[PDB]
A paper describes a structure:
The virion is composed of a structurally distinctive capsid (called core-antigen) containing the genome and polymerase, and surrounded by a lipid envelope with embedded surface-antigen protein. Capsids are composed of a 183-residue polypeptide, the first 140 residues of which suffice for capsid assembly. The assembly domain is also unusual in that it polymerizes according to two different geometries i.e. T = 3 and T = 4 icosahedral quasi-symmetry. Accordingly, the same polypeptide chain exists in seven quasi-equivalent environments (A, B, and C in T = 3 capsids, and A, B, C, and D in T = 4 capsids).
The T = 3 and T = 4 capsids were reconstructed to essentially the same final resolution– 3.5 and 3.6 Å, respectively, and atomic models built into the resulting density maps. In the current T = 4 structure the corresponding Cα-RMSD values are similar: AB (0.792 Å), AC (0.737 Å), and AD (0.603 Å). The same analysis was then performed on the T = 4 capsid described here, with similar results. The CB interface involved ca. 25% less area, 18% lower free energy, and 42% less burial of V124. In the T = 4 capsid, several residues were identified as hot spots with high confidence. In particular, F23 and F122 were identified with high confidence in all four interfaces, and when these residues were mutated to Alanine and the proteins expressed in E. coli, capsid expression was either largely (F122A) or completely (F23A) inhibited. In contrast, R127, which when mutated to Alanine enhances the solubility of capsid dimers, was identified with high confidence in the AA, BD, and DC interfaces but it was not identified as important at the CB interface. In T = 4 capsids there are two forms of trimer-of-dimers, Types I and II. As Type I has the lower potential energy, this form should persist and nucleate T = 4 capsid assembly for protracted periods.
Residue numbers in the entry:
A (entry chain B), D (entry chain B), E (entry chain D): 1 to 143
B (entry chain A), C (entry chain A), F (entry chain C): 1 to 142
The structure:
């Protein structure tokens, strides 16, 4: 069970490790986006796509991790350990959760095919060194 | 954002508030059962039933948390915070992950409706004093 | 070569990893039951169901191992190695042979699907703390 | 329950005790043969013939006996007992398991009828003393 | 024989001397992208295109070379020679492996004709002196 | 990417490693044969068959390894490391490249099915003992 979360969505995780951290914007932005755009889809008792379901589970998990951060904030005495822990959290689990959220929400809004083709073109782009790399990378949209 | 992860299956988090904490099992056994019964359906490219997807994401989350715990165990100095964090994980977040995993596993194998009937029958069983309560609470099979 | 002997029946060795060791019964009683219920179908020339074939080969293997144990008991000098080997057989290899025999016997008599349901229901029963667990775990019959 | 493992395959064990040990080659050769030729049949969750099923069970049993040998190798102090035990193993259980494996795999590759007729002719052959016995015994093939 | 490997696909090594070295990105990025895209089709027991087959052979070649690198790292004593071997490998032979990977992967995604047109357009781009050279080097897209 | 390159042609490294290593000829004679027969087809602009393509890429890999060999021979100072590296190459990677080249060449000349049958028959020949084995090993041909 080395399970790939994207295998049922056509892609893999090695695909997405090509592109950097900074392209993934803040967790709070993605959560607010998801809420504002698809609260009707999330809260309703009908699953339109498995993207929505994994999105629900990821949002719940991230809420639990925020509870973890708060609990460690309100109980531990050593500032070093607390800072190190929250740094690890908001860096690495931030990376992974932002990745997952971006993929699911992008595939919903713009379509699975378009996202896969975008990631193909981006993997071709960023894998080019600066000399022959264009300065303004591809951007995402439907048509 | 105020989501109940069970809203899409007819169930509700309040419905599991019937069940106590101690009832749900250790995590290692759950993961072992899940793998040994559904390895091929998990790793394969198919969302044959969305319970599979929830199980995928839950297992990945628990792996992420185990990586967190190991990272903390092999980097920090004060063992107080270390053991405290490990305890907090394995108790409190273990509760949520156990809830979610148990539910989705039971729904995969035995069926959603039968699981709902199991939960409500257990709530009837436990909303009852000890004496007239039979000592063999319901456990499920087909 | 990495074979699971249960792969051909929808089951999996990981699925039996739910069950503990002590649960499965002594070997002599299993062999007695097997013979007394299926002597004619075993010795007869017919592979009416492949569980019969697995049972044949398993009984022959256990007879081979009992012959091994007797051969060691009536040829060696140091009783340490003697009793050690006998213990190792009757515990560790007994585990595998008991697993295999119990499964194939239950599948012969009661049915493959019902046995799978039995295993998963037992896993639900045991992935549960002691208190809310009923003290009458499922046992099977028709 | 003096069960014959071959009664459901047309033959018996007294049939095969006519022919010698040496005709059965090494266990490792047979296992590697079985793997190389029919890993797709073994590992798949579909039983094509009861030969395959008994083959699975025999391979698992032999793996367990190898585990037995290793365990005795790693725990006992008396070299005499260890050597005697492993000798018994690789001689006698070697004989039986090689017999079983050869029969099943041969019947699969070449057919049950051909194997039974081969064993008939061989029992007629080796049961002849050297004077009137041919020097180059029968060999196995389809056509 | 000095086979021109790109000869089946209308392309040349002369066509690749248009491109500089730095244009090709790091090998780990290539492998990660290739995995996350087409891991299933690679491990799939089917030859979808000769591109796939050459890609499989090249991945195995790189695996052999990295295994060699690890062996030499874990057994050799003369350190300057060791480091020089490692750098020589991962630069000089990594270059050609990157050429191979990039070509076949881009041909899989976007098509052979498109890659050829890309290469000749890039040649027109770089063979222009830097003054009147436009600032945007072309890249690829399904847009 | 647990890749086995022979999957495109109905075989595996395990099916191929069923033979010993000594059977596999030296790489030099293989390149001699392959060149002196199919140089015109392999340098051609034509994907005549995937066997040719795997052969092309494999020959590139081996030529590049020989380039490495010459670089090492003409640029290191410590001859011990030179010997270790070079003989390690021609043993370990020599084995794999020999296997690959022989497979694809045999498939070109005689045909895929025939080479598979030859592997099977030769292995069953060589592992079976000589007395009851056929007197001569089979040798593949149309």
């Amino acid at each position: 069970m080395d399970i790939d979360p994207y295998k049922e969505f056509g892609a893999t995780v090695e695909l997405l490790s090509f592109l950097p951290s900074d392209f993934f914007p803040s967790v709070r932005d993605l959560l607010d986006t998801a809420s504002a755009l698809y609260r009707e889809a999330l809260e309703s008792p009908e699953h339109a796509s498995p993207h929505h379901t994994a999105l629900r589970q990821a949002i719940l998990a991230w809420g639990e991790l925020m509870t973890l951060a708060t609990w460690v904030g309100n109980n531990l005495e050593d500032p070093a350990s607390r800072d190190l822990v929250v740094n690890y959290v908001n860096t690495n689990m931030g990376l992974k959760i932002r990745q997952l959220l971006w993929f699911h929400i992008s595939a919903l809004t713009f379509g699975r095919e378009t996202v896969l083709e975008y990631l193909v073109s981006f993997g071709v782009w960023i894998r080019t060194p600066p000399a022959y790399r264009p300065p303004n990378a591809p951007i995402l949209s439907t048509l």
